[PDB]
Structures are given as C-alpha cells and as structure tokens.
Amino acid sequence: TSKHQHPVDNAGLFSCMTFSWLSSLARVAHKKGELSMEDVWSLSKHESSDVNCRRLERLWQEELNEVGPDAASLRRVVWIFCRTRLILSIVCLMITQLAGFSGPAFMVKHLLEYTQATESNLQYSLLLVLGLLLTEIVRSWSLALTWALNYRTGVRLRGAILTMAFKKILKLKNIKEKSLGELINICSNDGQRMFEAAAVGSLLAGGPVVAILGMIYNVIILGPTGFLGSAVFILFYPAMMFASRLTAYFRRKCVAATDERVQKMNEVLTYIKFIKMYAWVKAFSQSVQKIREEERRILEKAGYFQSITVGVAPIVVVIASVVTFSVHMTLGFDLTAAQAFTVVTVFNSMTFALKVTPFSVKSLSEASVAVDRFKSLFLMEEVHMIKNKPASPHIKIEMKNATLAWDSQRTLHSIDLEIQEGKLVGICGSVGSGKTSLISAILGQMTLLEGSIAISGTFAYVAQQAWILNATLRDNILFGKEYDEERYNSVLNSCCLRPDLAILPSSDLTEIGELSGGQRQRISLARALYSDRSIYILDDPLSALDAHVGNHIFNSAIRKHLKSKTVLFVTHQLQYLVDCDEVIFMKEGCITERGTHEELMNLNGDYATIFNNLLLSVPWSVYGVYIQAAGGPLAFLVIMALFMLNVGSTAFSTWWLSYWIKQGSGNTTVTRGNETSVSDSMKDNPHMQYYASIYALSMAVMLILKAIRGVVFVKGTLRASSRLHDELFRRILRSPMKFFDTTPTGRILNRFSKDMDEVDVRLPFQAEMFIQNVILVFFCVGMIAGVFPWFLVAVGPLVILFSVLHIVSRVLIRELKRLDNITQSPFLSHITSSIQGLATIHAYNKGQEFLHRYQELLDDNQAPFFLFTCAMRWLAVRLDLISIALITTTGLMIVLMHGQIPPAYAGLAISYAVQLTGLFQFTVRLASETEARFTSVERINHYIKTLSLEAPARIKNKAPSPDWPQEGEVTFENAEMRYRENLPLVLKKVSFTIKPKEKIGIVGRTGSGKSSLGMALFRLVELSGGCIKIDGVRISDIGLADLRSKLSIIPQEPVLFSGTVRSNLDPFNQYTEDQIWDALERTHMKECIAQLPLKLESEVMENGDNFSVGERQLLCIARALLRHCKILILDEATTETDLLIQETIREAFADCTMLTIAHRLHTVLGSDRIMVLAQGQVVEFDTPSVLLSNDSSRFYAMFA
Amino acid sequence: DALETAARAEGLSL
C-alpha cells in the first residue's frame, strides 16, 4: 500500500476500456506468481471513506430536517447520492443495448439478402462485415464502461454507509436491546449487499427495452404471426420462478434434515469409547443410515428440480423457433431463410437479456430489505453527556435532587450527594439496590429528569466483566498513551503482575484473545492506574480476586497512589470501609444513612445488621477416485453420451430447419397464370407435412432427452456421494481411539458437518453447468468447422491464446482472493473487539481513535476486493474481444465464397457464430469453482485413506464357551501397559488375583494407573507384556464382541443418548417389558415413569438434560444392571440422593464381583479389600481393617 | 439458482 496516485485518475478512456493498468499488474503477477500488500495501490482521494461519510451524513441531516424523523426514506438519500453516476450508467447501457440490437439483426438481414442474390458485389459485403465488427466492438466497450462506473459508485456507497453506520453504533445508548450477532452482521455483509444493489441494478435497467425491440422487429419482419414467437418467454418464465421457489422449499427441508443428522453425529462421536466397549455400533449405524436415506430423498427431489432449471436458453430458443415456424408454414404464409435466421439471432439476443435480469431483481429485493434494516438501526436514542460545570472546581461531582427511570421503571428517588476532591467515598448496599444504576447514571447513559448534575474532569472506570482489548499486554495498558519505563514498572509491581509475566514466556508481547478472571481484573486495574484521569470510580475490584492479594493491592494502590485524587469505591464486601474516608449506604434507590464510619455503626442502623452478618491444485488421482466412487467409467460414459445426445438433437432441429429451407420447390412445375414454369416456392412441395411432423418429433426429443439426462445425472451423483459417506462411516467406526486421543473432535465434526453438505449441494451443480457449457461451445464450434474447416484451423491459435489467458486470470484471481481474505479477517476481529466493550470506550472518550482505525481497516480491506472485481471484468472484456474476432472472421469467410453455398447453410452458420458470443468467462469461472470443490473432495479422500484398521470383531480363537465366564476369578501376571509409543509405561510389573463375589477398591494418586485397569481388562489397548487370566482363560484368545458382550461398567458422568427411553435402555429390544419393569422397580423409577403417558416413549434429548441428577444416575445404573454381566466395575460414581444411590448399588449387585474405582475414602470404607497404586505398582494387599490399624500403612496416611 | 449464478459469474463474486 505505497503509491502516489491511483492509476484511475491518470488513466485515459482507452486505458479505462482495456484496463491496461491491471494488464501490467497481471503481467507482473505472472512473472512472480505471488502477491504482497506492498505491490497493490492504495485508495484514491475520490473514494476516500471520510469524504463520502461527510456527504452522506450531510444529506441524511438535510432529509431529517426536511421531512422529520418520522417518514424518512434512505432510498431518496442514496438516490441523490448516486444520481449522476446512475444516469451515466443507464445512458451507457442503453447505448450497449441499442448497438447489440442494431448490429446483429440488421447486418445479418442484409448479408443474407445479399447472399440470396445472384450478382457478386464485394464492395458491399466487406462494408457489411466492417459494420458488424464495429457494432460488436462498440457494444463490448460500452458494456465495460458501464461496469466500471457501477463498480466505482458501489465502492463509494459501501464505504460511506459502513462508516456512517459505525459512527451511529458507537453513539448508541444501550447494547442489550439488540443481539450482538446481528449488530456484527450489519457491518459485515451489508457492504456486499449495497455493492450488489448498485452494480446489478444499473445492469437491471437494460432488459425490457431490448426485449420490446426484439418483439417489434420480429413482428414487423414476419407479420401478425410474430405474437406466437414473442409469447413463449411470457408463458415460460413463470415456470422458472416456480422452479426456483420449489427448490428453495426443498432446500429448507434438507437443511433441517442435515441439522438433525449432524446433531446425531456429534452425539455419537462424543462418547465414541463408551460405545466402543459396549458393541452398540450397529444401532447408531442404522439410525444414521435411515436419516441419510431421508435426506437423500429430499436431495433427489431438489436435484431433479435444479437440473430441470439449468440450461433453458437453447431450449427456449428452439421451442420458440419450432412453434413460430410451424404456425407460419401451416397457415399458408411464405418465408425465406433470411427472415428465419434474423428471427433466431434476435431470439438469442432477448435470451441473453432475460437471463441477465432475474438475479438483478433478486439483488434489488435484498437491497430493499437491507436499507430497511439500516433505517431501523438509524432511529434509536443517542447517548447524551452531562456537560454542566459545577460551581467550583473543588467539587468535581455535584448533583441535586435528580430522579431517574431505567429505559426498557423508576429506581432512584430524591438523591442528594456531594463529593469533594481527594476524598475516598465508599458505597454500601445489596444486589439490586441501585449501585449499578447510580454508577451508570453518573456515566451518562441516563437522562436528566429533575435538578441538574455537575460533572468536571475526566473519568476512570473499571468493569465488572473486565473487558480485555484484543491486543498484547503492552498495548492495552497504555491505551493510546506514550510509553514509560519507571511508571509502567511501578504500576505492574503494584498490581502483582509479575506472576503473569513469569508464567507466560512471551507475556509482554502475547496477543490476548477476545486467561483467568483475576488476571483480567488486575490488568484492568493496571490500565486504570496508568490512565491517570481526574475522577476514579471503581466497582467490586476484589470480587473474583483472591482476598489476600486483593487486600495487598488495595493497600499498596488505593491507600498509596490515589490519596490525592477523587476516588469512588463500590464493593460487595463491607470489611474494606473501615479505613475509608466516607461511607454511603445505598438502599432501594433512596439515601437512608450516610456519614463517617464510626458514626455509621453508632447510629445502629440496618448497616450494622448486615455488617455483623459477614463477621460471623489437485492431481488426476482425485478425479480418478471420484469417478471410481461414481460407479466406474460406465456411468461417466453414459452421462457424456446423454449430454452429447441432447446437444446433437438441438443440432438436429436446427439442421432440419436448414434442410427444409434448402429443399425449396423440389423441381415442381406449377402454373402462375397463362404460362407454367418451375417456381422455387416452399408451399409447392407436397411433403411439408412430413417436415412439420419431424419438427414435432424434434420438440418431443428435446423435452424427453433433457428430463432423462437431468434425472440420470442427479441419481448418479447422489449414489456416488452416498457411497463415499457409507465408506467413511464404516472406516471411522472401526478406527482406533488414539485418533480421538490425539486429534480434537472439532476437525472430524467439521469434516462431517460442512464438507459433506458442501460437496452434496455444490459439486453436482457446478459440474453439470460446466459440462453443459463446454459441450455447447464444442458442438457449436464443431458445426461451424463442419461447414468450413478453414475456420477450425483459424480458431486453433485462438484456442491456445484462450488457454494462456485462462491461466493468467486464474493466477491473478487466486492471489487477489487470498489478499482479500487476509485483509478481511482482522477487520472482523476489530469490530468484535470494539463492540464487546463499548461502555469503557465511551467512558474514556476514545471514540475518534477507534473510528480512525476502522477507516484505515476499511480502506486496506476494500482495496484488494475492488482490484479483484476489476480483474474479473478485464478477463471478461478480453474473452469478449476474442469472440468478436471469431464473429468477424466467420462473417468474412461466409462473404468470400458468395454464390457457392445455399443461403440456409450460411444463415445457420452465422446464427451459431452469433450464439458463440458471451460463453467463455462462464467456462473459466465454472472451472475455478469445480477445481475448488475437487480440492475439498481431495481433502476428504486423504482424510479417509489415512485411516487404519483394528483387530476384527471375529477371530480364529472362536467363542471361549457358551457359558463364559464360568466364574468371577481374575488373575493378573506382570501387566505392562503404556498409553502410546515412547510414552512412559503406566503399568509396571503388577500381578494380583481377585476372588469371586468380593468388593475391591482401588485408591491412588492422580495418574497412578487407576484408570488404566479399565482399558487393560477390556483389551481396548493391546497389552505390551504379561498375560491376564479370567477363569483360567487368557483374554487375548477371545473375540472383541464375545468378551465385550459380557462386560459392563458405569462411568463417572451419566451418558444419555438422544431418543426415547426404550432406545436409551435397550435399542435391540432383546428384553421383555416385564423385565424392564422389574429393573425399573429395583432402581425405583416406575414412580417417575408410569404417570407419563409416553412412559416407554418418553423423548430424551442430548445428554438427557431434563430429568434430575438422581434420575439420570438411576437410569444409568439400570443400564448396567439389566445386562446381568458377571464382572462390573464402577469409576467414581459421584446428600440424601447420594446415600440413596450408594445403598441402591450396595443392594443391587451383592451376587457378582465388584471392582470400585473410587477417589473418596469415606464411600469405600468397610470394603472387603483395598487396592493401592504407587505410580503404577501395588505396595499393600490386605483388608482395610488391618490397614487402618497400622500407622505405617500407606492406606492410613491420607485417612487423617 | 442457475440464473442467479449466471450474472454473478460475469464479473461479480460467487
């Protein structure tokens, strides 16, 4: 961002048309391949934010003074702001449409009429081709000028409206009235909305005029029969809007469907391990499958409609042609080739215009909504400031008999206060008494009702929430002040920030995110101390702070530093007011007791009652794997064949028109009066009915082929996507737990959440559009070549140049987009930081610096975006110029061989060549979108392929025994277990045996290995040494399901799945209802279930956060007891409810073997045996009765 | 929409 003047101000008209400045920039980019912030130009003075802001605010103020703040319309204001640019744009666009209508139609008509003639006159046809080239070039350049003007106007409007809106929000009264998210969104996308408004509306004012001109030309050429050809668009475009609405409705359905699916995915992956030792995978697998099939059906419907509404333009023109010409020929009217091809070319023209218009209409509607939202955010109450000076400077704060009512309520009544400088005043009261209300009123967010308030000097404020600036430590401490060393060191040492400095290695220069509450409080106090204002107000600075350090800070700062300035103390603790100079008690918005502290206990008021209370790019591999997932090359071949059939059938219809016209009379001898001669008239052929029938067949083929191709393509793409989904789910559910132990769940959730919907709702769309575009262009070029091969050998080098231009433009576009994103991110970060702490900024009167910073950010954010848009326009201009060269050369080629080809063939050739225009930038953009989507699918493919496989659920070891386990005897032998490779071993030579029907409690320090036994016994992580024997059978020789079906545990936290009680208890329904009722009555739950009319169908939400904690624990332990497993282990299950839970557990499993992982000694007291772990090893093994009787026993150490 | 992306792909953001 280093430049003297922008190239815009120094560019002439020709440079403005060819974008020579961006041509040089793109050449430099291609030379280097990378861009930097320094290589781009800064904003010119014409589009500076401040000047536009001044103009917009002046106009808004004038309108407000004119009509009043009751019926103000920002539409008129923006209209006056951009009137001149709008009239220039509409005049230029009118020129564009006039040229693009007068050139092709008139030149084609004259050229075909000359071709139909016999005599050769090259002096005329060369003039005609020169004229048509002139019109094409003029139309292209005028369109470029229109778009440049629209871009400049849109940039100016967006900048002005954004900065004015920011000023308005910075001058806001209350922030809790409206949500923060929408307030951020009002400054995030409204600029894009205004850009779309300006540019695409100025483009919108270009369609109806050319449509009407085309209708008039068609009717005057043909006769009263042109209405049939002009009514097709009227009868059709309602169908397109209907299809759009239906697609929107189906999308609204599938978004909710996929929200449900992703919620289920998050729920299942949250407790992946919990499912892992239960072997319940199949149930959630099937549930995900049925949700997937529902969403797949909705996607099928949406895809049918989308593929219906994709490529109607050639279909529309073909339908218009067939209907019009069948009607014209059946009713005995005559015709020639020239009229036909003029008609089809004009039809192409209105198809272009009417394809341009609709998104412009939509953008205008969105703009209307956005400006209405802005008007809503323009008419709130503005925060006032009390600037009435006091009688004397000694009385810094003065206020006399003022009452207030919170805006949303009278709170404060009949207040009389007076505080002098240098006096410390404390505030005493309860929550809701009015402390916050009074400090806010002094802050100036409250209006003035009675008397007056006198405020002098600056203010210092410390927040209850302790707002933190989004910067490093050294930035927010100065808060716009110059840096000092001794003062900063003294302030830092005063608030005990040294531990904060030592803990973080780069604490002095570490950006703070938008830490601990005490750290925020202390840095807030440090900032207040460094601020050095006049009046220092303060509320509860030691609420979240520790008592000792808070007291030390108070003594070292308030009693030392601010002994000579006015300080207001507010706190919820009344023990600090003993040494305060003056104490004010605040109660129910009215002053009741006040004075000195000693007198304040002397008066024995309500203060004393509460005072004593506290005292007591991607390679071809991705394409190949996607094709393979699609179902092999056969589906690819079928879809290509369908597209080729569609375009070839359109070619068949047009070529049949040509053949019909060329057939002529067919050597028919007719009488025209007193003599007979052969007359080349269409109506004299006795086989025109056959041609009409072939036309009807062509239209039927049109419709049927389009429908079949759309349905087949949508079905194939959705089949491929569902196959990929099923493969990924199958692999991920057979994945190791180390995946989740190492990688956070956020990445996997995002892979399931956003990437999947992205591919499903984007890749088919762009892929199909790109395929249709390329196949249409290729078929038209193939036709023109099939008429003239010299055209093909001429357009070869043009193809090479097009490839070069595409490469250069792709490089430049990618670089520009990267720069735009990298400059956009800190912009949003700054908006969030500013909106977070508005009250403090208003209190310190630092508004101007914030707005200046925001203007800087807006400038260096909008520079690259404007450059990027201009680059896209430049690419479009270049491709349009290439197409103009093509049209010129094909016109000259048609001229040169006059008299040797039938006129109908020349007409079809020129019509197709005209159709070739404006079909290249579409291809480039679609290619870019397709490669981005394939980059996403490449990421998904790498993610799925980089997985691993565990041991199979079935192994050659077979089932151990139908009655396994026979007993509850387990013996350990030298257990060596480690969490990961190279990780320190958690298990180190531990061997023990447990007799059946015994309660065993494992007690040890954190990380001693108490948790490791759960994974060790379940074969979850493979043993690194030794063996584990249960009933004399080694665990490693049993299949995963075989032993996972006979083991059950209870976790520390209740695990409740979304669904029903029946699903949450036993999804497989392998138990009878009476057994469930017996389990519930054993767990004492029928009393809480029977009264519900959905007793076994009671819905359970995520984590089951609707019952009490006792109900959750009871249902969980029921989910353990119904499995009747021989071996069951608890892991720290944790007054009356707790005792009930413990007694229920004691009475429940008295007939099995109990292993207890409990961190509480009191609960495990009286157990049969106690297990002690010494950092992965056992030191004592005996009954706890003899262990508590031994002082030297480790078990007796922590008991005291 | 197919028509919505028609005008955007000309010279505007997608």
Side-chain angles (χ1 to χ4, degrees):
Chain A
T1 46
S2 182
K3 63 104 194 171
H4 173 224
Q5 328 182 339
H6 208 92
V8 169
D9 301 355
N10 315 125
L13 274 96
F14 205 101
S15 49
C16 173
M17 301 335 307
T18 85
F19 293 143
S20 317
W21 51 318
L22 272 73
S23 79
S24 152
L25 262 282
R27 170 195 43 74
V28 166
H30 175 59
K31 177 54 199 177
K32 290 330 273 170
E34 56 90 13
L35 263 290
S36 90
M37 269 320 318
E38 285 71 15
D39 324 312
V40 308
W41 322 99
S42 209
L43 255 293
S44 97
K45 319 308 180 201
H46 292 100
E47 309 81 6
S48 194
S49 82
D50 38 9
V51 187
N52 294 132
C53 184
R54 283 200 252 86
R55 301 279 77 74
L56 165 68
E57 67 94 12
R58 188 171 54 84
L59 262 50
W60 170 239
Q61 196 40 275
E62 295 331 294
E63 206 265 7
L64 270 192
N65 299 341
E66 276 268 48
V67 295
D70 37 14
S73 88
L74 316 163
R75 317 218 195 100
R76 258 225 285 260
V77 199
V78 300
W79 166 254
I80 318 144
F81 177 58
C82 72
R83 200 158 49 188
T84 80
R85 305 311 267 276
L86 272 194
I87 88 174
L88 275 167
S89 197
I90 65 150
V91 154
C92 215
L93 197 65
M94 268 323 92
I95 288 318
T96 65
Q97 281 323 271
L98 164 156
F101 186 88
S102 159
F106 264 51
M107 297 332 89
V108 161
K109 189 173 148 287
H110 278 288
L111 208 39
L112 285 204
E113 292 257 21
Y114 167 71
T115 284
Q116 267 182 211
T118 82
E119 192 46 282
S120 89
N121 225 16
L122 51 98
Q123 306 84 319
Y124 294 174
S125 35
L126 284 199
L127 268 190
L128 299 187
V129 304
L130 169 142
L132 72 86
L133 156 72
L134 259 284
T135 87
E136 225 58 36
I137 278 189
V138 155
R139 177 274 290 182
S140 183
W141 285 4
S142 189
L143 205 61
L145 175 55
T146 293
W147 278 47
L149 281 168
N150 295 335
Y151 272 172
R152 264 151 61 180
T153 318
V155 154
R156 292 189 196 183
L157 188 50
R158 157 171 192 256
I161 198 47
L162 263 280
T163 177
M164 162 46 48
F166 175 63
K167 178 55 199 333
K168 189 52 151 310
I169 165 178
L170 205 30
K171 275 284 307 308
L172 220 32
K173 259 286 194 227
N174 303 355
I175 77 90
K176 294 177 301 178
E177 315 182 329
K178 314 142 191 73
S179 163
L180 294 323
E182 65 96 26
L183 255 187
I184 296 170
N185 294 318
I186 209 76
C187 293
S188 305
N189 310 332
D190 281 76
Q192 314 299 128
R193 216 59 39 83
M194 291 315 78
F195 218 60
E196 296 332 280
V200 199
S202 153
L203 254 288
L204 163 153
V209 74
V210 53
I212 288 305
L213 277 148
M215 181 285 258
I216 287 301
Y217 204 142
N218 249 15
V219 63
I220 188 187
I221 282 284
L222 220 66
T225 81
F227 295 139
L228 296 324
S230 290
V232 281
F233 311 92
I234 285 288
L235 268 283
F236 253 50
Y237 276 32
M240 334 323 301
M241 63 75 85
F242 220 56
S244 61
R245 170 155 143 219
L246 270 157
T247 48
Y249 161 74
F250 278 112
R251 207 65 37 82
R252 210 278 323 134
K253 276 216 176 355
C254 34
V255 55
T258 191
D259 167 318
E260 177 60 87
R261 191 195 43 92
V262 71
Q263 169 265 16
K264 186 43 181 312
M265 201 36 48
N266 179 26
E267 161 56 48
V268 62
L269 80 95
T270 313
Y271 319 107
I272 166 61
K273 77 150 278 312
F274 177 88
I275 307 314
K276 204 102 181 163
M277 61 304 297
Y278 273 130
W280 292 16
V281 167
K282 311 200 184 316
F284 329 89
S285 157
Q286 291 156 356
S287 168
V288 167
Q289 286 282 13
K290 39 195 55 59
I291 301 157
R292 176 67 179 169
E293 85 160 329
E294 286 331 288
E295 72 166 30
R296 100 190 293 166
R297 282 187 175 99
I298 300 159
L299 297 213
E300 295 159 56
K301 299 207 205 87
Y304 308 141
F305 279 176
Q306 283 313 0
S307 196
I308 281 312
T309 192
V310 160
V312 309
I315 283 305
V316 157
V317 71
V318 156
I319 283 311
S321 166
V322 51
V323 161
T324 318
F325 277 73
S326 154
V327 169
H328 194 80
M329 237 311 288
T330 321
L331 275 309
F333 260 131
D334 203 349
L335 83 159
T336 43
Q339 300 150 337
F341 295 111
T342 51
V343 159
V344 307
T345 39
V346 175
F347 270 139
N348 270 225
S349 317
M350 297 133 308
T351 53
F352 266 25
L354 301 188
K355 106 181 306 186
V356 156
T357 200
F359 155 98
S360 64
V361 152
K362 166 164 83 85
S363 175
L364 254 293
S365 88
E366 274 314 283
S368 179
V369 170
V371 50
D372 287 315
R373 264 191 280 128
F374 265 117
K375 198 266 301 174
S376 78
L377 198 73
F378 250 84
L379 272 309
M380 321 66 91
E381 206 178 11
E382 307 311 285
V383 47
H384 85 92
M385 49 311 284
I386 319 177
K387 279 177 180 178
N388 322 133
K389 289 328 269 204
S392 70
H394 176 87
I395 306 178
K396 274 185 176 291
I397 185 155
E398 195 208 12
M399 182 305 298
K400 152 70 187 170
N401 214 57
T403 63
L404 72 84
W406 269 47
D407 201 353
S408 298
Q409 188 218 121
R410 318 211 48 75
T411 70
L412 266 286
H413 307 89
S414 307
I415 305 308
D416 263 34
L417 84 89
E418 194 277 321
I419 299 163
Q420 308 146 11
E421 61 96 16
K423 286 175 65 179
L424 161 68
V425 192
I427 298 311
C428 278
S430 85
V431 198
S433 63
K435 332 160 303 185
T436 63
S437 181
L438 70 92
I439 47 192
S440 286
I442 307 302
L443 260 189
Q445 62 78 53
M446 194 45 211
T447 186
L448 186 134
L449 296 190
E450 290 85 23
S452 82
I453 311 186
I455 289 299
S456 85
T458 41
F459 256 44
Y461 181 103
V462 284
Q464 256 174 225
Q465 293 54 20
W467 170 62
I468 295 319
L469 178 58
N470 183 75
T472 80
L473 257 283
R474 198 166 299 240
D475 315 311
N476 60 334
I477 177 67
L478 320 166
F479 215 79
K481 261 191 63 176
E482 70 276 346
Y483 186 79
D484 195 16
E485 283 88 58
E486 59 277 10
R487 195 197 272 264
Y488 177 36
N489 203 313
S490 49
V491 167
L492 177 130
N493 286 337
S494 280
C495 210
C496 322
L497 264 302
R498 292 295 189 197
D500 299 25
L501 250 55
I503 282 157
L504 204 54
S506 197
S507 39
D508 275 12
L509 325 163
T510 289
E511 179 266 355
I512 319 161
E514 285 130 5
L515 285 182
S516 92
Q519 298 152 343
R520 316 173 234 280
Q521 176 84 96
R522 73 191 78 262
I523 178 64
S524 80
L525 324 158
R527 161 208 283 146
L529 286 193
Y530 208 101
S531 294
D532 198 89
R533 298 298 200 95
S534 96
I535 294 187
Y536 301 77
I537 88 163
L538 167 159
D539 52 82
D540 44 52
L542 328 166
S543 164
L545 198 41
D546 167 78
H548 163 44
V549 298
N551 271 77
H552 162 267
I553 284 158
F554 155 63
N555 301 304
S556 43
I558 288 98
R559 323 188 65 182
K560 305 313 182 196
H561 290 70
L562 266 306
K563 292 306 287 185
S564 313
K565 304 196 201 79
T566 325
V567 167
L568 266 304
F569 210 117
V570 191
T571 167
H572 80 94
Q573 318 199 50
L574 320 177
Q575 62 263 27
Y576 303 90
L577 283 104
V578 279
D579 317 328
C580 84
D581 182 26
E582 214 275 348
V583 47
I584 294 299
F585 197 101
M586 191 66 277
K587 209 42 197 173
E588 301 113 7
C590 293
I591 171 60
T592 58
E593 45 197 7
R594 80 179 201 178
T596 63
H597 189 238
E598 296 310 313
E599 286 159 328
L600 191 101
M601 311 76 78
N602 273 24
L603 56 95
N604 285 335
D606 82 273
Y607 143 78
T609 69
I610 194 55
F611 187 79
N612 55 70
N613 161 246
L614 84 89
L615 298 176
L616 315 169
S617 160
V618 291
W620 312 115
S621 150
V622 193
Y623 294 67
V625 75
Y626 181 67
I627 295 330
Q628 282 179 8
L634 60 104
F636 192 50
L637 287 187
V638 165
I639 289 172
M640 300 325 88
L642 292 188
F643 274 100
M644 266 211 156
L645 217 39
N646 192 277
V647 291
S649 292
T650 66
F652 173 80
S653 170
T654 288
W655 168 75
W656 193 237
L657 179 39
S658 88
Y659 200 83
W660 196 338
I661 285 295
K662 181 222 167 305
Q663 261 325 103
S665 150
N667 226 6
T668 301
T669 321
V670 317
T671 313
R672 290 297 98 196
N674 52 307
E675 266 312 309
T676 78
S677 96
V678 186
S679 88
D680 38 16
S681 38
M682 201 36 48
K683 41 183 293 298
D684 293 344
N685 177 50
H687 295 153
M688 56 53 64
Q689 53 280 50
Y690 299 153
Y691 309 147
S693 309
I694 302 307
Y695 261 69
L697 167 137
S698 268
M699 153 297 289
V701 159
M702 280 314 80
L703 172 71
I704 297 310
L705 255 285
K706 197 205 183 324
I708 288 305
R709 174 211 60 78
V711 157
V712 168
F713 158 81
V714 156
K715 267 191 167 314
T717 292
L718 278 181
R719 284 294 100 81
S721 189
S722 196
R723 264 281 302 106
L724 262 198
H725 163 74
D726 202 345
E727 207 34 72
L728 182 163
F729 201 38
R730 181 71 274 184
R731 210 54 63 76
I732 192 175
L733 256 285
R734 285 296 296 111
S735 54
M737 321 175 258
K738 301 330 279 166
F739 198 154
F740 332 111
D741 311 334
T742 49
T743 83
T745 87
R747 328 285 91 79
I748 322 167
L749 187 132
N750 290 133
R751 291 328 96 73
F752 261 108
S753 80
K754 58 107 165 186
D755 221 332
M756 271 285 258
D757 79 27
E758 153 154 28
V759 53
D760 271 331
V761 317
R762 304 280 266 282
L763 183 81
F765 211 174
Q766 325 274 28
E768 188 262 2
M769 220 166 288
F770 179 77
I771 277 303
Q772 210 147 87
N773 207 214
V774 67
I775 205 80
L776 178 56
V777 160
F778 222 122
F779 227 75
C780 175
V781 152
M783 201 95 78
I784 299 315
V787 193
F788 310 115
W790 321 139
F791 151 96
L792 161 73
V793 291
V795 310
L798 271 43
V799 152
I800 293 182
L801 258 58
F802 155 76
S803 79
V804 164
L805 268 283
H806 161 83
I807 289 165
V808 171
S809 275
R810 174 210 328 171
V811 160
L812 188 69
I813 286 318
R814 200 181 54 208
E815 292 309 311
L816 259 292
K817 178 67 64 63
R818 182 182 61 88
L819 297 184
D820 191 9
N821 156 267
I822 213 61
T823 189
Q824 155 161 310
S825 197
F827 185 86
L828 268 283
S829 180
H830 174 61
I831 311 148
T832 51
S833 161
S834 44
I835 187 53
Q836 207 45 78
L838 165 138
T840 37
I841 326 161
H842 176 20
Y844 272 142
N845 233 21
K846 295 250 165 316
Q848 326 81 324
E849 294 79 59
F850 274 75
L851 73 87
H852 180 84
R853 290 292 322 283
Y854 188 167
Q855 295 183 348
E856 285 182 356
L857 289 197
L858 192 133
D859 281 44
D860 52 11
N861 183 15
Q862 78 180 25
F865 141 73
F866 168 64
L867 282 187
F868 165 81
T869 50
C870 278
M872 214 186 295
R873 198 46 186 145
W874 172 70
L875 170 57
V877 162
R878 285 298 135 85
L879 293 185
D880 173 7
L881 200 141
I882 275 174
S883 167
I884 292 170
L886 193 34
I887 201 76
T888 279
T889 192
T890 179
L892 170 163
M893 190 45 90
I894 272 296
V895 162
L896 172 43
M897 26 177 46
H898 143 82
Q900 306 133 59
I901 42 186
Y905 297 85
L908 85 87
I910 198 174
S911 83
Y912 271 102
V914 164
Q915 194 173 274
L916 258 204
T917 204
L919 251 58
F920 289 147
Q921 58 276 59
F922 219 74
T923 281
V924 178
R925 219 61 40 76
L926 294 199
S928 61
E929 305 316 307
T930 282
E931 58 141 350
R933 300 303 107 82
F934 257 36
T935 279
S936 283
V937 77
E938 167 271 342
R939 172 179 97 219
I940 310 151
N941 164 276
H942 153 61
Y943 217 127
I944 185 62
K945 203 58 49 162
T946 189
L947 259 291
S948 71
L949 177 62
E950 316 319 281
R954 174 263 161 204
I955 47 187
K956 201 75 198 138
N957 298 143
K958 303 311 173 314
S961 276
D963 56 343
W964 205 66
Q966 285 78 14
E967 252 314 303
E969 178 75 50
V970 55
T971 58
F972 263 49
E973 292 92 352
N974 325 298
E976 317 313 308
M977 158 34 49
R978 52 197 223 157
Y979 263 41
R980 271 181 289 275
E981 217 290 307
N982 90 66
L983 263 281
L985 270 64
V986 192
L987 255 290
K988 35 197 95 75
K989 218 69 53 198
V990 186
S991 179
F992 61 96
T993 169
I994 302 293
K995 301 181 290 283
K997 304 177 89 72
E998 290 207 293
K999 51 183 143 183
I1000 310 296
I1002 303 198
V1003 47
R1005 288 308 304 270
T1006 36
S1008 47
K1010 309 180 314 174
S1011 323
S1012 167
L1013 273 305
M1015 261 56 37
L1017 193 31
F1018 274 73
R1019 287 196 52 190
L1020 295 202
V1021 185
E1022 310 321 297
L1023 197 46
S1024 79
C1027 290
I1028 306 303
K1029 283 299 195 167
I1030 299 166
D1031 293 2
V1033 195
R1034 195 177 73 157
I1035 51 157
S1036 158
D1037 316 296
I1038 284 85
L1040 309 189
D1042 313 329
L1043 91 180
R1044 274 166 180 166
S1045 307
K1046 272 307 295 177
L1047 268 304
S1048 324
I1049 82 150
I1050 308 106
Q1052 195 279 327
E1053 208 263 311
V1055 200
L1056 330 168
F1057 315 154
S1058 308
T1060 88
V1061 168
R1062 268 300 310 118
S1063 93
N1064 269 2
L1065 199 39
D1066 177 61
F1068 290 102
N1069 313 322
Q1070 300 318 296
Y1071 287 157
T1072 184
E1073 309 260 312
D1074 219 341
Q1075 274 175 310
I1076 306 179
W1077 290 124
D1078 292 324
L1080 289 166
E1081 72 92 24
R1082 277 186 192 246
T1083 323
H1084 321 141
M1085 206 33 96
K1086 219 178 304 319
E1087 45 264 27
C1088 318
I1089 292 312
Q1091 71 276 33
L1092 266 304
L1094 326 170
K1095 32 185 167 192
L1096 291 203
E1097 292 72 63
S1098 160
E1099 164 291 338
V1100 197
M1101 61 305 298
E1102 291 98 302
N1103 204 263
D1105 311 293
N1106 79 287
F1107 321 106
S1108 71
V1109 73
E1111 284 171 286
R1112 299 164 79 201
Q1113 303 333 101
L1114 265 42
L1115 80 76
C1116 295
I1117 64 136
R1119 189 159 40 205
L1121 64 93
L1122 78 180
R1123 302 202 51 224
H1124 59 270
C1125 300
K1126 272 305 181 189
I1127 318 293
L1128 164 156
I1129 315 99
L1130 298 67
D1131 176 76
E1132 282 106 2
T1134 51
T1135 285
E1136 184 40 60
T1137 74
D1138 195 13
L1139 297 169
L1140 192 53
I1141 290 159
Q1142 313 298 322
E1143 70 98 31
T1144 319
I1145 302 302
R1146 289 184 200 99
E1147 65 99 24
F1149 270 84
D1151 71 270
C1152 301
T1153 82
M1154 296 49 49
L1155 315 175
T1156 306
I1157 314 305
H1159 73 281
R1160 321 148 314 288
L1161 186 43
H1162 334 97
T1163 46
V1164 81
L1165 281 171
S1167 50
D1168 204 349
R1169 295 183 172 285
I1170 282 304
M1171 272 316 99
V1172 288
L1173 297 187
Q1175 270 59 34
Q1177 213 265 327
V1178 279
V1179 302
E1180 310 187 358
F1181 169 47
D1182 222 4
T1183 77
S1185 158
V1186 317
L1187 257 60
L1188 288 179
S1189 157
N1190 175 218
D1191 192 20
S1192 45
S1193 155
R1194 171 256 178 218
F1195 181 59
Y1196 188 67
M1198 72 303 288
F1199 175 53
Chain B
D1 192 24
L3 321 183
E4 152 181 356
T5 183
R8 299 186 142 282
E10 213 149 33
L12 255 287
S13 191
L14 264 190

